[PDB]
C-alpha cells in the first residue's frame, strides 16, 4: 500500500496493521511432546498477527510464487 | 347444585384450609431434593450432581 | 439520527447521496464510518480536538468529500485529497 | 443463643442454594427480562432477597465475580428499565375510583442488600461498570424515581390540603 | 425522517453530534462489513459482469480466489458444532444471527441474495465448458446450496424475516424450475411456518407435481420430513389453511 | 445405475409351515395358517419380505420416510385422506406389524404411529382439550359418587369409579364412503378395538419379561423401539376411556407392587410421566365430583334455612332473590 | 358391463329384490392385481339395498345377476365406476375393476 | 359438621399411596443419573410439585366447572361439539373451507338455548379468547383482509356483550381485549361495508352502557381515535373513491363511526361524563380537522355553508356531485351531512346544562364557552328546517348548551315537522309511511322544549 502518495490518494492502514502476540529466543522450543508486556530484542523469535483478521503470519509451507523462479 | 357454593369453597380454601398444614412442604422437599444418595465409585461419599443442581 | 446512505438497489452513483434515519438503521451496516487519519505513526492515538482526517464509508468503500457547490458527495481513493477529504471536529460552535 | 442459632440455620438454608448456582440464575433471569415488569421477575427478586437477607458476603462476591466475568450489560439495562416501568400514586385514577408496590420495595431491597456491610466493590460497580463497553448509573436511576414519588405525593397532599379530614383509602394510598 | 444535510456556513446552532462506537461485541460488526461485504460485492460484481460474454482477464475473474472466498464465507456462517457447551453455542448463534441480519439491512432481500441469484446465469455447466478458459460451471453446487442455506437459516435467524424467498415467491419458483438444491428449500419451509406461513400460501399444484416428477428420480432425501411433511404440517404446530 | 447383484445373501425364514404327510393314500394336511408381508410399490417395486430389509439400509429409509408422510397428511384432523389411506395400509398389516417381534424398529414405530394418526388423533386430541373444564350435570347418579367407597378412608383406585361428566362422544364410518367426515372418527372405518385392547396388554406383559433379563435381543434393535410405541398406543387408548376396571386392575398390577422399579432409558420415562399425569387428573375429577355431590344436599338444606326465617327484598314480595341472587 | 363369472355357485334361484340388504363379504381388486379394498379382514360384511343408489351400479347389477350362496368374479368398467375423474387418492382415472363377491343373505 | 368433616376428608392430602410412589420415584430417577432431554426434567418436577400442591389443582379447576340439570344435557353436548370443532380450527387458522365450518359453528352456538338460561358458561370455556384468536389469525397485518367474512364480530357484539343482561361481567373481558384492539386497532367493515371498521363495534359494545368501564378508560385509548379522525381530513372527488374508485360508485364514509364510538365513550345511560369529555374536547381542539368544502381559517368548521353546498350535490344528482340523480334515505351527501350531525351529537353529549349538578361554576364554563365559540349555534335554527335525523343532533346542542324571544324566533320546534307529522298519518302511496318513525320520533326531541 503506497503511502508516499498520501496527498494524491489516501492509503489503508486497517489492512496494513500488525500485532505482536509473542516474542521468544530460539532456545524456547518445545514441540508439545504469558509474561505480560515483555520488551523486544534483536535476535528474538517473533510472532506477528494481522489486527482485524486473526491470520497469524507464521512459518507455513508456501511453495507457490515463481516470479524470481526461486523464492517463497 | 348452584355454582355459588363452588365460589364459596374457592375463597374458603385460601383462608380456612390453605396454611402450613401443607405449606410446611417447602423445607422438607428441599431437604429431600438435596442429598443425592449414590455410590458411583468416584464421589466423596455422594452427590454426583444432586437434583436441585439439575 | 445517524449519517445514513440509501440502500444498494441503485448502485452506480445514487449511493453517493445522503439521508438520515433514526430508526433501525442505527444498528446496521450502512450507518458506519472510519477515521482514516493522515498521520501514519500514532494513527491509533487518543484523538483530541483539532486533528484532520478523511472519512470512509465501510460498505461501499468510498471516502467523503465536499464539492465546489457546497454539497457532500463521496469520493474514491483516486479522487480524494487533503483539500476536499479533510475534516475535523469542533468542541464549541465558535470558529477560532 | 436463640438468635445466633437462627442466623446459622439461615446460613445453612442459603448455602443449600448458593452452592448450586442460584445467584447466577437470578442475575440471568433479570438480564433476560429487558425492562418488562412481570411476576416471573418478581419471584426472582423475592428469591434474591431471601438468599441475601443479612449481608451475605459469599453471594455478593459470587454475583460480582459472575458479572465481571461475563460482562453482561443486560442486567443493568434491565434494572434501569425496571425503575422507569415502576409506578406512582396516579391521583386521577383515585379521583375516578371515589365513585404495583410490593415489587418496588422488593426491587430496591434487592439493590440495597448488595451494598450491605459497606461492600465498597458493589457500591462502585453500580456507578461505572469500568470493565465493560457500556455503563449505567443505577444511583441516579433511583434518585429519579425518588423525584417521581415526591411529585406524586406532594400532589396527593395538595388535593387533601384544603379539606378537613382523610378517608381510609387516601391514608392507605399514603402509607 | 430524511433530514438531508448540507454544510452550511453556520446553520443551526442546535445540531449536536453524539457518538456511538462499535463496542467490544460489535468488533464483529466492524469486521464483517470490511472483510465479507464490500470485498464480496466487488468480487461478485467482477464475476457477474464477466459472465456476460466479456474478455476474461481484463477484470476480476480470479477463480483461484472466488472459490476460496465463498469457502471462507461458508466457514463464517458455519453452525456452532452441537457438541459444544451451552453458553458458547448460544453466543455463537447470537453472532451468527447478527452477521446474518447485518447482511440483511445491507440488502439480502435486494442485493446480496439477489447477487447470488444474479450469479446464477447458467445455461449449462457443459456448454459453457468450452467458452471461457477451461472452467465456468464447476462449483455451482457450493454457492447454490450453501449460501441459500445461509439465507434460509437467516430467515430462521431473527423470527420475523420471511422476506425474500417467501416474499419473492417468484424467486422461489426460480429454484423450482431447476431442481438441483432440494436441501435449502426445506430450510425455508420449516422455518417459515413457525414464524408465519408466507411461502406456502401461493405454491400450488404446478409446483408439487414437478416435485413429484423429481421424486421418481430419488430415494427419499432423508430429511423428507422437512420438505414434504412441512409442506403439509409444520411438525405439530400448523396453520390449518 | 444399479447392477442386478448376483450375490444376494439375506433373510431366509424362521417358521415355514407345520405340514404332515400321513399314509393310507399318502394323506397330507395342515391346519395352521400363516402369512407374511410383501413389498411392491407403483414407483419402485421390490418383491421381498418386510423382514428382508433389516440387512439393507436404502429401502428402510425410504419406507420409514414414507410412513412419516402417511402420518403427516392424516394429521390434526383429516378424514378423507384417512379413508384413502385405509386401502393401502388395511387393518391386518397393522395388527401383524405390532404383533411381530423380528421387525426393524424404524418400521415398528412408523406403523404404530400410522395406526395412531388415522385412528387415535382426533377423539383423543379433542377430549384432551376438553379435559380441563370439569362440567357436570346433576342426576341421582352424581350423589352416590363420594370421595371414598368405604368408611376406612382407604386410598381408592383412580380409574375405577363412576365419572358422570359431559365428555364428548365417539362415532364411526366405513371406508367405502358416504358422509366421510360428518361425525365419524372412532377409526376412519371402524377398527376392532377390543382385540387391540387385549393385544396391547399381552405385548406389555411379554415385554416386561423381555426387558427384565437384560437380553441382547429386544424386539426391534434396542429397548426404546420395544417400549416407546407400545406405551404411546397404551396411553392413547387410556385417555379415550375404553378400559374397564378389570383391565385397569391388571394395569396397576403391572407397575404398583415391576416396571417403574426397572432400569429404563429417558424417552420411556417421558411417557410414564404422561400416564401418571392422566391418573392424577382422573383423581382430581373424582374429587370435584364428590364436591358437587356434597353441594347438592348442602345448598338444598341451606336455602331451607332462609325459608325457615322468611326474610324478603323489594316490592315483589317473596321473590326468588332471597334464596341465591343479588340483582 | 358386469361380465359376471361364477366360482362356486349354490342354488342359482334366490335372486335379490327391492328393499333387500345384500349381506356381502366382498374382496375388491384392481387390474394388475393391485388390491384396493376388502371386507374379509375387517370381519364386517357389507350391507346395501337395491335401487337406493347407495353403491355404484356395478355392485347392484352384479347382485341382480346373482343368486344366493354364489361366489363370483365380477368385472366392472369405468362407465359404471368412478370414470375419468376417479376416486381421489385411491383410484386413478379410467380404471377397470375386479371383485371376488360372495353373497350370503338378504334382509 | 358436615362441611367440616368434608374438608377434613378432602384436605387429608387424600387419595397417599400414589403420592408416596411418585414423589420417591422421581427423585430416584434424578438421583441415579445426570439426565439430559430437559423436556423430561421439566415434567418430573412438574409432577413433584403437583403431588404436594394438590390444592393447586383445585384452585384452577373450580373456576372452570359448572353444574346443570338433567334436562340440559343434549343442547349443551351439541354446543361442546361445535366448540371443539372450532378449537380444532383455532391456532391452526383461517382457511377457505374452514371458513364455512367456523360460520356454521358460530351459527349453531348463537341459535342455542343454554346461556339464555345459564349465567356463566361461555366465559369459563374461553370462547371469547378463542374467537379473538381466530380474528387475529385472520388479520395478522394490514393491506389485505384476505378472508373478508368476520362474522366473529357479529357473535361478540350482537350476542356476547348483550347476553350480559344476565351477568354484565361478560363485557369486562372484552374491555380487557380493548387492550388487544389498542395494538389491533383495525379498519374493515363486514356490513354494508364501505370503510366503517366493524371491530370498532366490539369496543362500542364493550362500553355501551356502563359507568364503571367508561370511567376505566384512559386518554391514549382515545388519542389514536382522534388521530384517525385527523387522518380523515381529505377531499371528495369521485362517486366512491375508496382508495381509487375501481368500478362501483355509491358512497364513502370514514369518520362517522369513530364519533359514533365516542358517543358511547362519553355518554352513559343518562347524564354524560366529564372525565372523558374534557380530554376529548381538549384533544379535538388541537386538531379540529373537520375540513368542509370552503370556509375561513379551517376548511369548513361551519355547518350551514357546507350543508347547503352538499345539498346541491345530493338533491338533483346522486351521492356524487356528477352522477345521474339517484339518492334518498342514503344513510357525497352522507359523510358530509351525517359527519357533522354525528360531530354535533358528540359535542352536545359532551357538555352539561345551566342549573345542572354544575350550574356553570365548576370549570365547565370553559368548555361551555369553547362550545359556544363554534354564532353558528344561534344560526342552526335555519338548519333545523333545512334526513330528519340530522337535525335532532343540533337540537341536542341547543338543549344541552342553551330568553323566550329565542324560542319565538322559531315559534315551535318547527312548523314543517309539525305539519308533515300532522299530515303523514294518512295512508298514501308516496310521501307517506317512510316517515312512520322519521318524523314521529320528533316528539322525543321536541317535548323537552316543554320548558
Short mmCIF file of C-alpha atoms in Angstrom, two decimals, chain C residues 37 39 41-48 51:
data_model
loop_
_atom_site.label_atom_id
_atom_site.label_comp_id
_atom_site.label_asym_id
_atom_site.label_seq_id
_atom_site.Cartn_x
_atom_site.Cartn_y
_atom_site.Cartn_z
CA UNK C 37 -6.38 9.76 9.77
CA UNK C 39 -0.68 10.56 10.40
CA UNK C 41 2.67 6.85 13.12
CA UNK C 42 0.43 7.09 16.19
CA UNK C 43 -2.64 6.65 13.99
CA UNK C 44 -4.15 4.77 16.94
CA UNK C 45 -3.53 7.72 19.23
CA UNK C 46 -6.03 9.03 21.74
CA UNK C 47 -7.78 11.54 19.49
CA UNK C 48 -8.06 15.18 20.60
CA UNK C 51 -6.96 16.91 14.09
#
